[PDB]
PDB file of C-alpha atoms (C1' of nucleotides) in Angstrom:
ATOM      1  CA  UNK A   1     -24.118 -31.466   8.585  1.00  0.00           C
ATOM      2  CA  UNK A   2     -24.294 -34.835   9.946  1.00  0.00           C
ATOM      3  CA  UNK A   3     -21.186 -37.505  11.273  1.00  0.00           C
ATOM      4  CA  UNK A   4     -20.730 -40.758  10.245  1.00  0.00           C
ATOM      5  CA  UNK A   5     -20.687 -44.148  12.097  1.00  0.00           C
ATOM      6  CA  UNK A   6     -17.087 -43.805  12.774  1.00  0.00           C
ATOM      7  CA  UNK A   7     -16.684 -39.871  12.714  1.00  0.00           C
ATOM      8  CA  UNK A   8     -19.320 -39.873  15.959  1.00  0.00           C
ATOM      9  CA  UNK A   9     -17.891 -42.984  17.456  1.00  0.00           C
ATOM     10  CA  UNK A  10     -14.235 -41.598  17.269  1.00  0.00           C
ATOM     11  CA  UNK A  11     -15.184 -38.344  19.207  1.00  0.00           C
ATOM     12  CA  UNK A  12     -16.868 -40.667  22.056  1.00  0.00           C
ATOM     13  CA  UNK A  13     -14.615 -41.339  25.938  1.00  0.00           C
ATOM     14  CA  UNK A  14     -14.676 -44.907  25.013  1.00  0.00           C
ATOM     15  CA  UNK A  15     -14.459 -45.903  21.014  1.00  0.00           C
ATOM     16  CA  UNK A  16     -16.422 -49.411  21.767  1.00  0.00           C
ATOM     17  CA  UNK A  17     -16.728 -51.842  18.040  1.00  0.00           C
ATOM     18  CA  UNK A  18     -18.431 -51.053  14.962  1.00  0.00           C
ATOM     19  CA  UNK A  19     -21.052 -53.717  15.807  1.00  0.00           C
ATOM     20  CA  UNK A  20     -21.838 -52.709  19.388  1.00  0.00           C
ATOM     21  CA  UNK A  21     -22.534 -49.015  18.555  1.00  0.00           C
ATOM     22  CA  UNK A  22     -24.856 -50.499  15.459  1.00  0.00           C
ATOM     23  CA  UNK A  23     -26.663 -52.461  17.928  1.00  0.00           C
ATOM     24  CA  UNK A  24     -27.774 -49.552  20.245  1.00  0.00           C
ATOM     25  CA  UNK A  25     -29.009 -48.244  16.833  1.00  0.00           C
ATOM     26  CA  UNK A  26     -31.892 -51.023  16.753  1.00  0.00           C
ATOM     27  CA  UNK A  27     -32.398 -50.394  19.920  1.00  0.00           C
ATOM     28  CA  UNK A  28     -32.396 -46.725  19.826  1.00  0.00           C
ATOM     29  CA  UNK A  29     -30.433 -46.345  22.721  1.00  0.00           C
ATOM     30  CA  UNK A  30     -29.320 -43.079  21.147  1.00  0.00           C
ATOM     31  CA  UNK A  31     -31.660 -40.101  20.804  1.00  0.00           C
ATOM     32  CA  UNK A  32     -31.890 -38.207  18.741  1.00  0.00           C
ATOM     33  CA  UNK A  33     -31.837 -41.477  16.570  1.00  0.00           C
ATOM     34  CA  UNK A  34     -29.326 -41.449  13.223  1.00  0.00           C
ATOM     35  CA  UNK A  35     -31.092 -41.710  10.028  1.00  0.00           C
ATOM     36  CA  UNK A  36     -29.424 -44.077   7.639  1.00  0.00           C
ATOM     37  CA  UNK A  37     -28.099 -43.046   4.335  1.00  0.00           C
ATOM     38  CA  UNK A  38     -27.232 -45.681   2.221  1.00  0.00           C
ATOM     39  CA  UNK A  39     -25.072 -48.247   3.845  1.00  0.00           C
ATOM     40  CA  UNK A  40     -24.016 -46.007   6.501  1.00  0.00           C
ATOM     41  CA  UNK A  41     -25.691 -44.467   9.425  1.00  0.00           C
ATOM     42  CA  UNK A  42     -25.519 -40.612  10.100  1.00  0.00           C
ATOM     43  CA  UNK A  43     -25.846 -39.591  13.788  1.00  0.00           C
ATOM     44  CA  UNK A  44     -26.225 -35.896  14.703  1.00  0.00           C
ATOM     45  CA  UNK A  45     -22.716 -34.193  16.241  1.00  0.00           C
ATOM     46  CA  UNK A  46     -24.794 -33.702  19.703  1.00  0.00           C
ATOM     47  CA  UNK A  47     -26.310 -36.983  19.338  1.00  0.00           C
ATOM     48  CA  UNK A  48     -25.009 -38.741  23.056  1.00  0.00           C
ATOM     49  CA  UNK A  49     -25.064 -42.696  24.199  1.00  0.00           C
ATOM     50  CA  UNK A  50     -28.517 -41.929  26.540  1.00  0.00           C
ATOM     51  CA  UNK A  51     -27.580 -45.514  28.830  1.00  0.00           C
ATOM     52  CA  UNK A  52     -31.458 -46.074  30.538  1.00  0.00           C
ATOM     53  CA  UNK A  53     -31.442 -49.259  32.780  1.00  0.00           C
TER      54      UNK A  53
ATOM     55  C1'  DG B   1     -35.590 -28.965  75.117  1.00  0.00           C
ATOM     56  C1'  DT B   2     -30.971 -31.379  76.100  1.00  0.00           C
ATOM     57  C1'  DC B   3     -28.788 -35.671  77.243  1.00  0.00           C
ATOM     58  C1'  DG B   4     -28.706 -40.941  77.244  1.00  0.00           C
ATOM     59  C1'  DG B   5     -30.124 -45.440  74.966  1.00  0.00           C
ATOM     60  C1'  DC B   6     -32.232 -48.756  70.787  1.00  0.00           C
ATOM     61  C1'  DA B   7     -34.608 -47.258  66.950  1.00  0.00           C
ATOM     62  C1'  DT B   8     -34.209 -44.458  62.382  1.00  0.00           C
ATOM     63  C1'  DA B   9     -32.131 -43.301  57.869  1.00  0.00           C
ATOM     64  C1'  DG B  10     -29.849 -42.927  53.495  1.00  0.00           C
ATOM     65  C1'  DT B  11     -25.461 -44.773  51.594  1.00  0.00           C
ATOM     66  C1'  DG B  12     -21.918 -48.389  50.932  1.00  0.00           C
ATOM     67  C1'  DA B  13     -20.206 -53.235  50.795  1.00  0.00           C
ATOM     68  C1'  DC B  14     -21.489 -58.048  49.334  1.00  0.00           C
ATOM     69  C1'  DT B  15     -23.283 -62.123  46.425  1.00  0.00           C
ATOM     70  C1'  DG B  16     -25.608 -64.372  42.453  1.00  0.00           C
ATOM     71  C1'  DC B  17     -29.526 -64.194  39.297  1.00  0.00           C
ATOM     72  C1'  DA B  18     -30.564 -61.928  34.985  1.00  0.00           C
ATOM     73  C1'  DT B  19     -29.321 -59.582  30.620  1.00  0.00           C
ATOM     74  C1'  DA B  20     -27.022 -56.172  27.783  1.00  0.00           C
ATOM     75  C1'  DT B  21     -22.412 -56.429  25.976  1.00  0.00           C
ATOM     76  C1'  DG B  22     -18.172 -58.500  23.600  1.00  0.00           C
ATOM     77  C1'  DT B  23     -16.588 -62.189  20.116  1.00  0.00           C
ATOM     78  C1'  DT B  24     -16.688 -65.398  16.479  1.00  0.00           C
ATOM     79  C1'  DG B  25     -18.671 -67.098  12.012  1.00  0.00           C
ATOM     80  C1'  DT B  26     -21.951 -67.395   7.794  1.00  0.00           C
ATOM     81  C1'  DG B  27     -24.022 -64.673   4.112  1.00  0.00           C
ATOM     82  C1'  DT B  28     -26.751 -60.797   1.478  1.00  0.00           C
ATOM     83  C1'  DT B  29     -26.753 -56.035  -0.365  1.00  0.00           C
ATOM     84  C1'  DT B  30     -24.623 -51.936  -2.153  1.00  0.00           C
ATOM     85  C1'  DT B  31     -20.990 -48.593  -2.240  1.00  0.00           C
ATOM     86  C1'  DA B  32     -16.587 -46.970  -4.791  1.00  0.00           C
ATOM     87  C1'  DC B  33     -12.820 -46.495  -8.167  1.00  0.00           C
ATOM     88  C1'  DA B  34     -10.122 -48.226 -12.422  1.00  0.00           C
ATOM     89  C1'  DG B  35      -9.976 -48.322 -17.845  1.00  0.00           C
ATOM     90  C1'  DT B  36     -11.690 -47.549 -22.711  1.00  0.00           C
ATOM     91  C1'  DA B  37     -15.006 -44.859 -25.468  1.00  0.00           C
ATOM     92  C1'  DT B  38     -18.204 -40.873 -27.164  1.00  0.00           C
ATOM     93  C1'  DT B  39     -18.859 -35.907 -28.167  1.00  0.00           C
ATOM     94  C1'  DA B  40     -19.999 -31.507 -27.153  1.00  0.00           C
ATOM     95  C1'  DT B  41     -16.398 -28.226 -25.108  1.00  0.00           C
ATOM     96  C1'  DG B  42     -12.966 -23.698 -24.782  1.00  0.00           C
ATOM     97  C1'  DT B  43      -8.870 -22.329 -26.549  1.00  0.00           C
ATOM     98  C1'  DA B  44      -5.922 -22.726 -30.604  1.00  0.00           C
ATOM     99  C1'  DG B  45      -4.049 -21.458 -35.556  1.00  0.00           C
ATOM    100  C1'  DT B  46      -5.469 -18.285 -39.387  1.00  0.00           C
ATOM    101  C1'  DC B  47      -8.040 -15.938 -42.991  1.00  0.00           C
ATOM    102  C1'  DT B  48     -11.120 -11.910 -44.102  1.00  0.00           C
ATOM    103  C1'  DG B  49     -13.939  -7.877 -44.106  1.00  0.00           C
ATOM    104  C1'  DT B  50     -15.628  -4.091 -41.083  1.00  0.00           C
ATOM    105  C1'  DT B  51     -14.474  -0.943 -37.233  1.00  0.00           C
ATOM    106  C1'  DT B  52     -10.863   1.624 -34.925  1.00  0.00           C
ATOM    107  C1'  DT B  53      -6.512   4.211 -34.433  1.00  0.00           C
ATOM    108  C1'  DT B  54      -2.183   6.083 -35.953  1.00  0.00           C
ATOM    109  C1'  DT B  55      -0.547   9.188 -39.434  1.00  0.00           C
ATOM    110  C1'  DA B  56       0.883  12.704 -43.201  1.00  0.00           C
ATOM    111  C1'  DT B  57      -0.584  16.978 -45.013  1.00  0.00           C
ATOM    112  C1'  DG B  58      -3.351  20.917 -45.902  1.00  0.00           C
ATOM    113  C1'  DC B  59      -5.113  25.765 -45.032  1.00  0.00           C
ATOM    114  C1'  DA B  60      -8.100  29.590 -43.356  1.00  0.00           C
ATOM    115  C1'  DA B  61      -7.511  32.035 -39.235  1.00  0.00           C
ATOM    116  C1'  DA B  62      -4.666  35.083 -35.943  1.00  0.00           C
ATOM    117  C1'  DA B  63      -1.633  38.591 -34.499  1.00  0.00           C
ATOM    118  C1'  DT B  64       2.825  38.993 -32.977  1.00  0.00           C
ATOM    119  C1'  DC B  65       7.568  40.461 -34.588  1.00  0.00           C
ATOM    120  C1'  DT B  66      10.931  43.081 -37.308  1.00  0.00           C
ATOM    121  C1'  DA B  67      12.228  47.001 -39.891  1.00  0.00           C
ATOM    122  C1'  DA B  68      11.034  51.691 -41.858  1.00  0.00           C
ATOM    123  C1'  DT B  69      10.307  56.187 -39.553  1.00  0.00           C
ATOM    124  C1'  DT B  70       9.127  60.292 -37.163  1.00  0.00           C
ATOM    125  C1'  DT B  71       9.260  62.971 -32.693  1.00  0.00           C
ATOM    126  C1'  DA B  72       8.938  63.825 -27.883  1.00  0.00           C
ATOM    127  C1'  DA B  73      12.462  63.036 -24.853  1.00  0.00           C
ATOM    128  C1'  DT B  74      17.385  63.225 -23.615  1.00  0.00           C
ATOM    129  C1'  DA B  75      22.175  65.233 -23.744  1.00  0.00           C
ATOM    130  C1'  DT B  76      25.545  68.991 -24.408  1.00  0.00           C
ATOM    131  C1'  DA B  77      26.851  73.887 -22.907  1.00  0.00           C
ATOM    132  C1'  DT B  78      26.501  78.411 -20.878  1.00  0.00           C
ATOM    133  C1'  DT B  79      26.709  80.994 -15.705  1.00  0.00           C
ATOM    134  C1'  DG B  80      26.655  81.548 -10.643  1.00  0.00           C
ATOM    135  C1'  DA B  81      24.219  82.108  -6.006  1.00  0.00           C
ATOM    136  C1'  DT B  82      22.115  78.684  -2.932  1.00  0.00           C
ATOM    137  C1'  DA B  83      20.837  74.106  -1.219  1.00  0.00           C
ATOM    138  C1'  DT B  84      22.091  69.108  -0.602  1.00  0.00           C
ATOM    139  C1'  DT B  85      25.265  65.246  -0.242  1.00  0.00           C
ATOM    140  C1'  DT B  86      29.601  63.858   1.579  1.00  0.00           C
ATOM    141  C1'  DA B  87      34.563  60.693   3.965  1.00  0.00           C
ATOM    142  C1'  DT B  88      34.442  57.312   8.949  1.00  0.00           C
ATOM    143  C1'  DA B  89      32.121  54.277  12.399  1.00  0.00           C
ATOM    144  C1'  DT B  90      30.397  53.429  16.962  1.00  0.00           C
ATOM    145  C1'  DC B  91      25.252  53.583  18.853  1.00  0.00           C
ATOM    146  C1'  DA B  92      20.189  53.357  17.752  1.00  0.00           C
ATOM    147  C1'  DT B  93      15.892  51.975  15.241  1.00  0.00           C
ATOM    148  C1'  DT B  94      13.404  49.886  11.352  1.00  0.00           C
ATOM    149  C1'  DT B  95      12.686  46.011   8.164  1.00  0.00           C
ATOM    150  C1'  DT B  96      13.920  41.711   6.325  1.00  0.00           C
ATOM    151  C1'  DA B  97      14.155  36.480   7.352  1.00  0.00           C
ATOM    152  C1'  DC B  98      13.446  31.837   8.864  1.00  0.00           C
ATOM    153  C1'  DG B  99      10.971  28.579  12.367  1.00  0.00           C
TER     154       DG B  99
END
DNA sequence: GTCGGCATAGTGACTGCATATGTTGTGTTTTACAGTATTATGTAGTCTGTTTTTTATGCAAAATCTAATTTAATATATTGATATTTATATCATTTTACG
C-alpha cells in the first residue's frame, strides 16, 4: 500500500540522493509525512516534495 | 472624455547576503540470507477385515408358437344372354413429390 524510500524517489522529475530526500523527512518538507517502518521510511504513492520558502 | 506629458504599475533583470542543498567522513543500530538440526507432516508401501460390485445360476411366472384338426371359404364345371373391359397415344386433369 505504501512505497519505499527509493520506490517514491525513483518515480520523482529529479531522483536527488538518498540523504537529501531523508533530510526533508526531518524537516517534513513532505506532507503527508512517511511513517517509518523499521529502517526504512514508507511515503504514500501521492505523497509530493511540497517546496515552501 | 480624448489626446499629450511625467507619474503609475506590475513584471523582469541585476547583485550579494543568507540558508537550504550537495559532498565527504565517522560511527551506531538493525535488517536479511546462508547452513545444520529437530519433528510433526502428507504421501508412500502393504496388510487386513468390512463394505461394495461383478458374477454364475436358479425358478416361478407368462404366453406366444407349432402342430393336430375341423370347416367356412375357395375352385372346378355346366350354359348362354347381357354388360364391361379392351389394343394405341396424343390432349386434359388429378395427385404425388420435393423445396
Amino acid at each position: 500500500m505504501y512505497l519505499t524510500l527509493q520506490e517514491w524517489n525513483a518515480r520523482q522529475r529529479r531522483p536527488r540522493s538518498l540523504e537529501t530526500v531523508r533530510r526533508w523527512v526531518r524537516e517534513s518538507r513532505i506532507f503527508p509525512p512517511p511513517v517509518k517502518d523499521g529502517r526504512e521510511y514508507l511515503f504514500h504513492e501521492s505523497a509530493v516534495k511540497v517546496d515552501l520558502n
